[PDB]
Symmetry: C3
Subunit: 156 residues, 3 copies
């Protein structure tokens, strides 16, 4: 006959979400070429047009320098594979500097200020092959079986 009150907390992050409102820069004059990319994964630049002024990007592969991370957008993205993706032949929202949430494949929390190493598919890994100049921003969390890590980005 006694009443019961309960309490629940929200999750703090989603893949490809901008971590906070610090100094950031979005490179939005790019176009997806040769396939599709995942929100929360790194991309590489294929070529930059001399006159038209659009860069050509795709998912990261072996032996390629990353350029940025795709970020969430409720308008520019299409829903496929139960998640947000960017389809081929369309404008993309690439983040080049700032704090972002990234998909992870590691199993242990990282160290603040250490260098970020990626996997061959553009996802963070504690023992990846591709080396970057980015550093960890401190965040490390999970959303319903999806691991997320907070990454600091600076311009190339």
């Amino acid at each position: 006959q006694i009443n019961a009150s309960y309490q629940r907390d929200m999750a703090i992050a989603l893949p490809g979400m901008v971590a906070d409102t610090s100094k950031y820069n979005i490179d939005g004059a790019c176009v997806v070429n040769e396939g599709d990319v995942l929100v929360g994964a790194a991309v590489q630049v294929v070529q930059a047009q001399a006159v038209d002024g659009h860069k050509l990007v795709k998912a990261l592969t072996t032996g390629t320098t990353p350029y940025g991370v795709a970020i969430r957008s409720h308008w520019q993205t299409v829903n496929a594979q139960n998640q947000m993706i960017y389809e081929d032949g369309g404008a993309i929202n690439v983040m080049t500097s700032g704090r972002v949430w990234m998909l992870s494949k590691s199993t242990e929390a990282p160290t603040f200020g250490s260098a970020v190493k990626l996997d061959v598919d553009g996802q963070e890994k504690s023992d990846g092959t591709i080396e970057t100049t980015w550093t960890y921003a401190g965040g490390w969390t999970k959303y319903k079986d999806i691991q997320l890590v907070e990454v600091q980005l600076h311009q190339l």
Copy 2:
């Protein structure tokens, strides 16, 4: 006339970044001294700052604030257990122990107290105020 500058005060209005979600874990922090991140909580998002020690990587420089911190001394100080402003990118005046101005664009080195001994770079400002010998430092975020 007027004094030229004070420790912990931002030099110019160029690109700057200030992290206000921090707290002094232990001891007191002097305004205008470098700080380091002892522990960054993964979920809570707060950074525990401390005065620079031997063989550690600096993070930023504590700045002044007339409301966040008050003190009975002439010089401002951050008390233990209080929110702290730390600037991570931009030009700031800093405490120094050197006596001659170094070359412009040189890479500066930090003492064990958080001071400036004989990566951040020199910006070109070298003044004197009440025997403090401020130095102007450019901080980048890596």
Copy 3:
């Protein structure tokens, strides 16, 4: 009689013009010393005043470190020699971070992300003897008998 209509396109850029509205930084507390500076060419620092605060700049020279690139302005520039120049003893708008259109004297288009090399006179050249931290941004065009190149400047 058959009616006719015509078409013509404008140019893309001008020497010394700011490329786009990405994150940039202009250092306006500078003074020109010992000579004239061409808009769209790199500059060097000869003395930074310790108390007054102004910086003394001049055209680039052999065995020196460049600081930035002067930009266009319709109020701070004098019209001499059928073009815009910065005269001696006047304030100059010097850019130290961002994308800019810069004078060039090479013959082949550059590759994205590679390092920039300068000539003795302060103009971009593919085999110059001066090393810079700057990179190429992909723009490469030509005004009337003038070559231009898009350059990304990082803060020194």
